[PDB]
Amino acid sequence: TRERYLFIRLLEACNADCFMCDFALSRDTFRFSLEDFDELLPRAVEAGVGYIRFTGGEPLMHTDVAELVRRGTDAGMKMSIITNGMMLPRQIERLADAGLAQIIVSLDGGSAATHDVYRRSPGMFDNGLRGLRAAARLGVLPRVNSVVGPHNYTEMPQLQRVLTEAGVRQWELSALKLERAISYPDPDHVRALCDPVYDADPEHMLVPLGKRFYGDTPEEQELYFSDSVTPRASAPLCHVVDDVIYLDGKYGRAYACSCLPHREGDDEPGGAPLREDGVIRLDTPAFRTHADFFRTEGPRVCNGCSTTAAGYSDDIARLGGVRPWQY
Numbered sequence: 001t002r003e004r005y006l007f008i009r010l011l012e013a014c015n016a017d018c019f020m021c022d023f024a025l026s027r028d029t030f031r032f033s034l035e036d037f038d039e040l041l042p043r044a045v046e047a048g049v050g051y052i053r054f055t056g057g058e059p060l061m062h063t064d065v066a067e068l069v070r071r072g073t074d075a076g077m078k079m080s081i082i083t084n085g086m087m088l089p090r091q092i093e094r095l096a097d098a099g100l101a102q103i104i105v106s107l108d109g110g111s112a113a114t115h116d117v118y119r120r121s122p123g124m125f126d127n128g129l130r131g132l133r134a135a136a137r138l139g140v141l142p143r144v145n146s147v148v149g150p151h152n153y154t155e156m157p158q159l160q161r162v163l164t165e166a167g168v169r170q171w172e173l174s175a176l177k178l179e180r181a182i183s184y185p186d187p188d189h190v191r192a193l194c195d196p197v198y199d200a201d202p203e204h205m206l207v208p209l210g211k212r213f214y215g216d217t218p219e220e221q222e223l224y225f226s227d228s229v230t231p232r233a234s235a236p237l238c239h240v241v242d243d244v245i246y247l248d249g250k251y252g253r254a255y256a257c258s259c260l261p262h263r264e265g266d267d268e269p270g271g272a273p274l275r276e277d278g279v280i281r282l283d284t285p286a287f288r289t290h291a292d293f294f295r296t297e298g299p300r301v302c303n304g305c306s307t308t309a310a311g312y313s314d315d316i317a318r319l320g321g322v323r324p325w326q327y
């Protein structure tokens, strides 16, 4: 059994205003507690978890995020945080001293003039880049998440050499996901600008993780451009559901991957309950049933997968294993 990733949606509140996320302008009051994390830690330790990644709205708004990293690290967990970067320069020193192993910053443009518009938060791009440079010199692994659609794909060649020059060592480039259909006016122009980004020398240019956001095979690219179906785990099986646990903190839901919490599917809550009798438990029979469904059906029904997770499952299918921070 491999080293698993545990996502915790610490909170839903956020300080940004992104057009594409439900937590834009969220002032929700739920806060995942240190008491919850103390009960969860031994359960994740025996569940084979080696990575705990904090997400949500904006985790740097959680007043305990540094103490959570400190306690997770003291239990042997490789700690990671996904942030929009606005507060990262102010907290990266304390986070690094607390044992933070990886920082993920979400950038959706090659410059402040575009990113700060997409997230409607002037100064967020600049603070994200500072926090990445500061994390690099503090020994933290710097990764960037990018969401790309018709509105910003021409910026990706510029973001690539910005990230490269800044010392970022991992880059997720995944497609915009919305309920409504997403159509590019000219898919050939998307390939003409973005194929060189993926065809760059990884020795000199940061090329993104996993699959290309518009697909790798001609069939995947047709399914993405013509029918807005995002690339997912190929092959017959998805193996991400064995290595990833995503805890929707506010509600009581645990998911077998980091994209299934954002799906629609049924109407009753997705995933499985995190608690059985007020007691936090992992890999419950309901959770194993939830994961078993998407292990078989994921490659066939999942319209909201990410490029990182698709490449993760494929490496398990072809190679039998993944490198440390492949998720």
Ligand SMILES: C[S@@+](CC[C@H](N)C(=O)[O-])C[C@H]1O[C@@H](n2cnc3c(N)ncnc32)[C@H](O)[C@@H]1O
Residues within 6 Å of the ligand: 014, 020, 021, 055, 056, 057, 058, 059, 082, 083, 084, 085, 104, 105, 106, 145, 146, 147, 175, 176, 177, 178
């Ligand atoms: C919900 S955010 C929470 C962490 C932090 N607030 C941030 O943005 O980096 C987690 C990731 O999901 C991405 N995301 C948000 N809305 C998305 C969408 N509609 N389609 C694809 N990715 C999305 C964001 O870019 C971010 O990298």
Ligand SMILES: Nc1ccn([C@@H]2O[C@H](C(=O)O)[C@@H](O)[C@H](O)[C@H]2O)c(=O)n1
Residues within 6 Å of the ligand: 007, 055, 056, 082, 145, 174, 177, 258, 259, 260, 262, 304, 305, 306
């Ligand atoms: N509408 C959305 C919004 C976010 N996500 C996923 O959220 C994950 C997280 O919350 O941590 C991220 O790691 C991942 O990059 C992103 O793709 C999604 O799948 N669909």
Ligand code: SF4
Residues within 6 Å of the ligand: 014, 015, 016, 017, 018, 021, 022, 023, 024, 025, 056, 057, 058, 084, 106, 119
């Ligand atoms: S900063 Fe993160 S949580 Fe907030 S609206 Fe943007 S993507 Fe959503």
Ligand code: SF4
Residues within 6 Å of the ligand: 232, 233, 238, 239, 240, 241, 256, 257, 258, 259, 260, 294, 295, 298, 299, 302, 304, 305, 306, 309, 310, 313
């Ligand atoms: S195929 Fe489905 S279950 Fe598997 S990683 Fe992608 S979204 Fe998750």
